Design a protein around this ligand. Sequence first.
Ligand SMILES: Nc1ncnc2c1ncn2[C@@H]1O[C@H](CSCC[C@H](N)C(=O)O)[C@@H](O)[C@H]1O
Ligand SMILES: [K+]
Length: 214
Amino acid sequence: DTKEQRILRYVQQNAKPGDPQSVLEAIDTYCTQKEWAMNVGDAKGQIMDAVIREYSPSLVLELGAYCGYSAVRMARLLQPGARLLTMEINPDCAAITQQMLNFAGLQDKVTILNGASQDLIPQLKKKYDVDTLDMVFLDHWKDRYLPDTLLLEKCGLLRKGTVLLADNVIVPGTPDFLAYVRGSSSFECTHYSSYLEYMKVVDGLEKAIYQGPS
Ligand SMILES: Nc1ncnc2c1ncn2[C@@H]1O[C@H](CSCC[C@H](N)C(=O)O)[C@@H](O)[C@H]1O
Ligand SMILES: [K+]
Protein backbone atom coordinates (compact mmCIF):
# COMPACT_ATOMS: atom_id res chain seq x y z
CA ASP A 1 0.00 0.00 0.00
CA THR A 2 2.70 2.47 1.03
CA LYS A 3 6.14 3.05 -0.52
CA GLU A 4 7.85 1.36 2.41
CA GLN A 5 5.63 -1.72 2.23
CA ARG A 6 6.30 -2.22 -1.49
CA ILE A 7 10.07 -1.88 -1.05
CA LEU A 8 9.88 -4.56 1.67
CA ARG A 9 7.73 -6.89 -0.44
CA TYR A 10 10.14 -6.38 -3.34
CA VAL A 11 13.12 -7.38 -1.19
CA GLN A 12 11.36 -10.41 0.29
CA GLN A 13 10.58 -11.79 -3.16
CA ASN A 14 13.76 -10.93 -5.02
CA ALA A 15 16.67 -10.63 -2.62
CA LYS A 16 18.49 -13.67 -1.25
CA PRO A 17 17.48 -14.50 2.34
CA GLY A 18 20.39 -14.10 4.75
CA ASP A 19 22.52 -12.06 2.36
CA PRO A 20 22.65 -8.34 3.26
CA GLN A 21 24.32 -7.45 -0.04
CA SER A 22 21.43 -8.91 -2.02
CA VAL A 23 19.07 -6.95 0.23
CA LEU A 24 20.92 -3.69 -0.47
CA GLU A 25 20.83 -4.47 -4.18
CA ALA A 26 17.13 -5.36 -4.25
CA ILE A 27 16.53 -1.90 -2.76
CA ASP A 28 18.89 -0.06 -5.14
CA THR A 29 17.15 -1.76 -8.06
CA TYR A 30 13.70 -0.90 -6.77
CA CYS A 31 14.36 2.82 -6.24
CA THR A 32 16.04 2.89 -9.63
CA GLN A 33 13.06 1.55 -11.56
CA LYS A 34 10.13 2.63 -9.41
CA GLU A 35 10.91 5.80 -7.46
CA TRP A 36 12.07 9.36 -7.95
CA ALA A 37 14.81 10.77 -5.70
CA MET A 38 14.94 8.76 -2.47
CA ASN A 39 18.61 9.89 -2.44
CA VAL A 40 19.97 7.59 -5.20
CA GLY A 41 23.78 7.49 -5.34
CA ASP A 42 26.71 5.09 -5.06
CA ALA A 43 29.23 7.54 -3.58
CA LYS A 44 27.31 7.55 -0.32
CA GLY A 45 27.44 3.78 0.02
CA GLN A 46 31.16 3.86 -0.79
CA ILE A 47 31.86 6.47 1.87
CA MET A 48 29.80 4.74 4.57
CA ASP A 49 31.45 1.39 3.83
CA ALA A 50 34.93 2.90 4.11
CA VAL A 51 34.25 4.77 7.34
CA ILE A 52 33.00 1.60 9.01
CA ARG A 53 35.97 -0.41 7.74
CA GLU A 54 38.44 2.33 8.68
CA TYR A 55 37.32 2.85 12.31
CA SER A 56 35.80 -0.61 13.08
CA PRO A 57 33.32 0.78 15.66
CA SER A 58 32.16 -1.48 18.48
CA LEU A 59 28.95 0.48 19.10
CA VAL A 60 27.20 2.58 16.44
CA LEU A 61 24.28 4.99 16.90
CA GLU A 62 22.15 5.69 13.83
CA LEU A 63 19.62 8.56 13.90
CA GLY A 64 16.74 7.88 11.48
CA ALA A 65 16.23 4.35 10.14
CA TYR A 66 13.51 4.70 7.49
CA CYS A 67 13.28 1.27 5.86
CA GLY A 68 16.61 0.06 7.21
CA TYR A 69 18.89 0.57 4.21
CA SER A 70 21.72 2.32 6.05
CA ALA A 71 21.24 -0.02 9.02
CA VAL A 72 21.69 -3.11 6.86
CA ARG A 73 24.61 -1.43 5.12
CA MET A 74 26.45 -0.51 8.28
CA ALA A 75 25.63 -3.57 10.36
CA ARG A 76 26.85 -5.98 7.70
CA LEU A 77 30.36 -4.58 8.12
CA LEU A 78 30.38 -4.76 11.94
CA GLN A 79 32.73 -7.20 13.60
CA PRO A 80 31.38 -10.03 15.76
CA GLY A 81 30.37 -8.55 19.10
CA ALA A 82 29.75 -5.06 17.74
CA ARG A 83 26.34 -3.39 17.79
CA LEU A 84 24.14 -0.87 16.08
CA LEU A 85 21.38 1.10 17.76
CA THR A 86 19.06 2.96 15.41
CA MET A 87 16.50 5.55 16.53
CA GLU A 88 13.29 5.89 14.47
CA ILE A 89 10.48 8.33 15.41
CA ASN A 90 7.96 6.61 13.09
CA PRO A 91 6.50 3.24 14.23
CA ASP A 92 5.58 2.12 10.71
CA CYS A 93 9.13 2.70 9.46
CA ALA A 94 10.51 0.96 12.56
CA ALA A 95 8.33 -2.05 11.78
CA ILE A 96 9.61 -2.22 8.17
CA THR A 97 13.22 -1.86 9.35
CA GLN A 98 12.85 -4.81 11.74
CA GLN A 99 11.53 -6.96 8.91
CA MET A 100 14.32 -5.79 6.64
CA LEU A 101 16.84 -6.84 9.33
CA ASN A 102 15.28 -10.25 9.93
CA PHE A 103 15.47 -10.95 6.21
CA ALA A 104 19.08 -9.79 6.06
CA GLY A 105 19.83 -11.97 9.09
CA LEU A 106 21.21 -8.96 10.98
CA GLN A 107 18.61 -8.74 13.75
CA ASP A 108 21.01 -9.96 16.44
CA LYS A 109 23.46 -7.14 15.61
CA VAL A 110 20.96 -4.26 15.56
CA THR A 111 18.51 -2.80 18.09
CA ILE A 112 15.71 -0.46 16.98
CA LEU A 113 14.79 2.31 19.44
CA ASN A 114 11.26 3.59 18.96
CA GLY A 115 11.00 7.33 19.57
CA ALA A 116 12.38 10.80 18.90
CA SER A 117 16.17 11.14 19.13
CA GLN A 118 15.80 14.18 21.42
CA ASP A 119 13.92 12.05 23.96
CA LEU A 120 15.96 8.84 23.60
CA ILE A 121 19.51 10.22 23.68
CA PRO A 122 19.26 11.37 27.30
CA GLN A 123 18.15 7.82 28.21
CA LEU A 124 21.01 5.91 26.55
CA LYS A 125 23.32 5.92 29.56
CA LYS A 126 20.92 4.89 32.31
CA LYS A 127 18.26 2.90 30.44
CA TYR A 128 20.32 1.29 27.66
CA ASP A 129 23.53 0.98 29.70
CA VAL A 130 25.67 2.88 27.19
CA ASP A 131 29.04 4.30 28.29
CA THR A 132 30.28 5.97 25.08
CA LEU A 133 29.48 5.75 21.37
CA ASP A 134 32.17 4.78 18.83
CA MET A 135 30.29 6.17 15.86
CA VAL A 136 27.17 8.23 15.20
CA PHE A 137 25.45 8.37 11.80
CA LEU A 138 23.19 11.45 11.52
CA ASP A 139 20.51 10.96 8.86
CA HIS A 140 17.21 12.15 10.39
CA TRP A 141 15.59 15.61 10.47
CA LYS A 142 18.01 18.23 9.19
CA ASP A 143 17.17 20.76 11.94
CA ARG A 144 18.20 18.19 14.60
CA TYR A 145 21.81 17.55 13.43
CA LEU A 146 23.29 20.37 15.46
CA PRO A 147 20.96 20.09 18.47
CA ASP A 148 21.51 16.35 18.72
CA THR A 149 25.29 16.77 18.42
CA LEU A 150 25.19 19.21 21.35
CA LEU A 151 22.94 16.87 23.28
CA LEU A 152 25.31 13.96 22.69
CA GLU A 153 28.24 15.93 24.10
CA LYS A 154 26.11 17.12 27.02
CA CYS A 155 25.05 13.60 27.96
CA GLY A 156 28.67 12.44 27.93
CA LEU A 157 28.17 9.98 25.08
CA LEU A 158 31.13 11.08 22.96
CA ARG A 159 34.77 10.18 23.60
CA LYS A 160 38.06 11.15 21.94
CA GLY A 161 37.88 9.46 18.54
CA THR A 162 34.11 9.04 18.35
CA VAL A 163 33.25 9.35 14.65
CA LEU A 164 30.31 11.54 13.61
CA LEU A 165 29.28 10.92 9.98
CA ALA A 166 26.48 13.20 8.76
CA ASP A 167 24.50 12.65 5.51
CA ASN A 168 22.80 15.32 3.36
CA VAL A 169 24.85 18.20 4.75
CA ILE A 170 24.51 20.13 1.47
CA VAL A 171 21.09 19.14 0.13
CA PRO A 172 18.70 20.31 1.49
CA GLY A 173 21.55 21.23 3.80
CA THR A 174 22.59 21.55 7.45
CA PRO A 175 24.78 24.63 7.36
CA ASP A 176 24.52 25.49 11.10
CA PHE A 177 25.81 22.00 11.99
CA LEU A 178 28.72 22.33 9.56
CA ALA A 179 29.74 25.78 10.77
CA TYR A 180 29.66 24.40 14.28
CA VAL A 181 31.67 21.20 13.89
CA ARG A 182 34.16 22.89 11.58
CA GLY A 183 34.51 25.85 13.92
CA SER A 184 34.94 23.84 17.11
CA SER A 185 38.32 22.65 18.35
CA SER A 186 36.38 19.60 19.64
CA PHE A 187 35.87 18.21 16.12
CA GLU A 188 38.20 17.48 13.22
CA CYS A 189 36.19 17.41 10.04
CA THR A 190 36.47 15.95 6.58
CA HIS A 191 33.99 16.58 3.77
CA TYR A 192 33.08 13.95 1.17
CA SER A 193 31.31 14.81 -2.10
CA SER A 194 28.16 12.79 -2.70
CA TYR A 195 26.48 13.01 -6.13
CA LEU A 196 22.72 12.36 -6.21
CA GLU A 197 21.38 11.24 -9.59
CA TYR A 198 17.72 12.21 -9.80
CA MET A 199 18.37 15.78 -8.71
CA LYS A 200 21.76 15.70 -10.49
CA VAL A 201 23.34 17.62 -7.62
CA VAL A 202 26.54 17.22 -5.59
CA ASP A 203 25.43 16.70 -1.98
CA GLY A 204 27.98 15.69 0.66
CA LEU A 205 28.75 13.84 3.87
CA GLU A 206 30.69 15.31 6.76
CA LYS A 207 32.93 13.23 8.96
CA ALA A 208 33.61 14.88 12.30
CA ILE A 209 35.86 13.22 14.87
CA TYR A 210 35.35 14.23 18.47
CA GLN A 211 38.57 15.49 20.06
CA GLY A 212 37.29 15.70 23.64
CA PRO A 213 35.82 18.64 25.58
CA SER A 214 37.13 22.10 24.62
N1 LIG B 1 13.85 13.43 15.77
C1 LIG B 1 13.86 12.24 15.15
N2 LIG B 1 14.14 11.12 15.84
C2 LIG B 1 14.15 9.93 15.25
N3 LIG B 1 13.89 9.74 13.96
C3 LIG B 1 13.60 10.76 13.15
C4 LIG B 1 13.56 12.11 13.71
N4 LIG B 1 13.25 12.92 12.71
C5 LIG B 1 13.10 12.17 11.60
N5 LIG B 1 13.31 10.88 11.87
C6 LIG B 1 13.25 9.74 10.94
O1 LIG B 1 14.47 9.72 10.22
C7 LIG B 1 14.27 9.17 8.93
C8 LIG B 1 15.03 9.99 7.89
S1 LIG B 1 15.22 9.07 6.41
C9 LIG B 1 16.64 8.14 6.88
C10 LIG B 1 17.07 7.19 5.77
C11 LIG B 1 18.03 6.11 6.25
N6 LIG B 1 19.16 6.70 6.93
C12 LIG B 1 18.52 5.34 5.07
O2 LIG B 1 19.66 5.59 4.62
O3 LIG B 1 17.79 4.47 4.56
C13 LIG B 1 12.78 9.15 8.70
O4 LIG B 1 12.38 7.79 8.69
C14 LIG B 1 12.17 9.86 9.89
O5 LIG B 1 10.98 9.22 10.32
K1 LIG C 1 36.55 21.78 13.79
